[PDB]
Every structure is written in C-alpha cells, then in structure tokens.
A and B are shown apart, each in its own frame.
Chain A
C-alpha cells in the first residue's frame, strides 16, 4: 500500500505536469502553424516583389 500510494502520487503529479506541457505543446503546434502562415505571408510579399 505504501509503494502504491507514493507511486500513484508521483505519477499523477508528473501526469498533471505532462498535461500542462501537452496543452502547451498544442499551443506550440498552433504556434508552428502560425510560423508556417507567416512564411506564407512572406511568400505573398515574394509574389508582390516577383510582380
């Protein structure tokens, strides 16, 4: 019981830590898509300068 309780407590603490990091990673993937869209905006300015 002592091993199970301590292990479950540390697992749930690191699981909520990974939960915060995973929601932050989803925001990070949205940020990477935002950087992809900004590269597309630079491609739009490249289209205008190409003209």
Chain B
C-alpha cells in the first residue's frame, strides 16, 4: 500500500489547453495510475512502470510517463506532505571566482552527501543586484578583496534540496576561517577548498530564515538577473558540452575531474532549458543529418542540462576526439581514454553532447546564454 499522490500538468499540443490530472504512485510495487480532477471519469487505468524513482518523486522535477512530459505541481495530500515536504528543505550555494578550477571535488562531495541539485547556473549580476548581496554584511573587517572578487570574478548560484539541508551543509562546511579550519584539521569543504578565508569559497547560509535573504540576494526574480557570465567569443568559440541525464545519474563531479585533467578549462555552466523548443532551435543542424533523432531529442526531453561553454586549449588532441566516437561500444573498442568509454551511457545518445562542425559553436553559445 502507501500510495503517494500528486497533481500533474500537461500541455495538449493539438488543442492548446493546459490539462490537470492526478497521478498516483505506489512505492514498493512500482505501480502508477492516473485519474482526472477536471473530469471525474478514469481515462488512464492502473499500470506498472519501472523507470520512475522515489528520488524522481520530488515537486518540480519533470518526469516522462508513457511519452508524456509533466511537472508535478501541487501536494494533493496531507500524508505525502508530512512524509516528504517536512524533511525536504532547500539550501543555497554559490561557486565564487576561485572555485571554478576546483569545482569537481566539491561537487563530488555534494553528490556523496546526497543533495539534489535543482539549479546550478553561472551568473553575472547587475549593479543593484550585486550591491544587494553586500548590503546585509557589516562588521569590523575590511572586505575589499572579497568585494572586488564578487564584483569582478564570475560566480554561479546553485540550489540543493535535501533532508535537513542547512544542517548537512553546515556539517559538511565546518569552520569559517581557512586558517582556523586547517588548524582544526578535519575533512571539510572549507578546510580542503577555498582561498584565504573570506576571499572566496562555496557560499553557505547562516540560518534557515537567512537562507531566503541570501538566495534573494544572489539569485532574485529575473528582472535584472543577467543572461551571460562569459565571453561570447575568444577566436575558438567552438565547444559545447551538455549533461541532460548523467546529472541525475550523479557522475557530474567525476566528469568535471576528468575534464579538469589534461589541462582543459571550463567557462560557463547553466541549468535552464525548455524541453523541446530551445533544444530544437540548436539541434537544427542536426535535424537533417542525424539518425535516431527521436532518441537524441528524447534523452534531452528527459531532464535539465548543466550545459557549458568551452574553448580549445591545446591542438595536440582535438576536443571532439577527446569527446570520442558517437558510440560508447566503439569507444571501448578503440581506446579507454575516450570520454564515452569512461562515462557514455547510451548507444548513440552519449553522455556529453557536443557540436561536430567547428563553425557553429559561437552561434550555439550566443544562443544558449546571450540570447537565453
């Protein structure tokens, strides 16, 4: 027994009406079922289904059932509200200017702690939104270096949802000063990572009430948010990475370590996309050429992408041939050093989707955060 119910919301394509249903999931047996709250008769009867997971049962995370895409909007129940929403709390974090070249181990520590990452996007904020971060802070110390790092160095804002997220973030972070943390010498995100104490770190809110103020300071409603945090071109604007489903698998930290290996930079990450139109807009070159196009748009339909602009660094190995052949088994035939043999999880729908022709990288990047 012990079903969990939700209210679902699907956009009907032919007659363009937004449709509200009630989905039911049955943990411990794998069943789903769907009635309609709008009209009380049953259209979808009960079925078993294997791909849905209890970690995918979170409000907001958009999950496909039987080739239909829906976002779980409400809590229709007090039982599941008590069972999940009392524990699932959100915490705010931010990659500062120093942590871009060391983010892989910190993200692996976050994935070992088990927080679900909702939105982790690079941002360059405006004047008022930049000053609203430093409006709250006031004390004896001189924070000129930290203020110049915030106003100059690029940053990323991220949201992590977890059971007692503030408590687990505090216990993972530990002491505040870098020298004090190193003198305490426990394994911590502040002890191992971060530069010069208050100069740069991964941001952590003091209290659950102050987390709202910190989140509103760093990432407010998108009026003056700032669409870009990186240069549009550097004469090699030709590498696009995207992670639609391997972020849900959790290997984002490990692939950040393997791309930090062999001396490759990472420029800009963000996590906003519409499932179809935005991807269609830039899979346009891919539209005539590629086969299994349905699958290659379905595993971008599946989830959000931490999609990332990257430049060519060395000419000794091309980034496309580091990314590897289009098939993971062909990669495992040829060389284990290919990123599909290390990480690729589908037959053609690789773990890192790139561009093939080197010309269109600049236009795809300008679309992906300059336009969007």
Contact = CB atoms under 8 A, between A and B. Distances in A.
Whether A and B touch directly in their complex, counting CB atoms under 8 A apart, is answered as yes
Interface of A: 42-43, 45-46, 48-50
Contacts of A42: 284-285
Interface residues of B, number: 10
19 contacts: A42-B284, A42-B285, A43-B288, A45-B285, A45-B357, A45-B359, A45-B360, A46-B285, A46-B287, A46-B288, A46-B289, A48-B357, A49-B285, A49-B286, A49-B289, A49-B356, A49-B357, A50-B288, A50-B289
A50 B360 CA distance: 14
Given A45-B285, A46-B288, A49-B286, 5 more contacts: A42-B285, A43-B288, A45-B357, A45-B359, A50-B289
Which of B287, B289, B356, B360 has the most chain A CB within a 10 Å cutoff?
B289
A3 B220 CA distance: 59
Contacts of A48: 357
Q: For chain A, what secondary structure do more than half of its interface residues adopt (helix, strand, loop), or is it mixed?
A: helix
Interface of B: 284-289, 356-357, 359-360
- Nearest 5 pairs of A and B residues by beta carbon: A46-B288, A50-B289, A45-B285, A49-B356, A49-B357
A43 B357 CA distance: 13
B156 to A, nearest CB: 31
A51 to B, nearest CB: 9
B282 to A, nearest CB: 11
A49 to B, nearest CB: 5
A48 B359 CA distance: 10
A50 B356 CA distance: 10
Contacts of B360: 45
Contacts of A49: 285-286, 289, 356-357
Nearest to B284: A42
A46 B357 CA distance: 9
Contacts of B357: 45, 48-49
A2 B341 CA distance: 86
Contacts of B289: 46, 49-50
Nearest to B290: A49
Nearest to B359: A45
A11 B285 CA distance: 48
A48 to B, nearest CB: 5
A44 B288 CA distance: 11
Nearest to B287: A46
Contacts of A50: 288-289
B239 to A, nearest CB: 15
Nearest to B355: A49
Nearest to B288: A46
A48 B285 CA distance: 10
A12 B356 CA distance: 56
Which of A43, A48, A49, A50 has the most chain B CB within a 10 Å cutoff?
A49
Contacts of A46: 285, 287-289
A1 B172 CA distance: 89
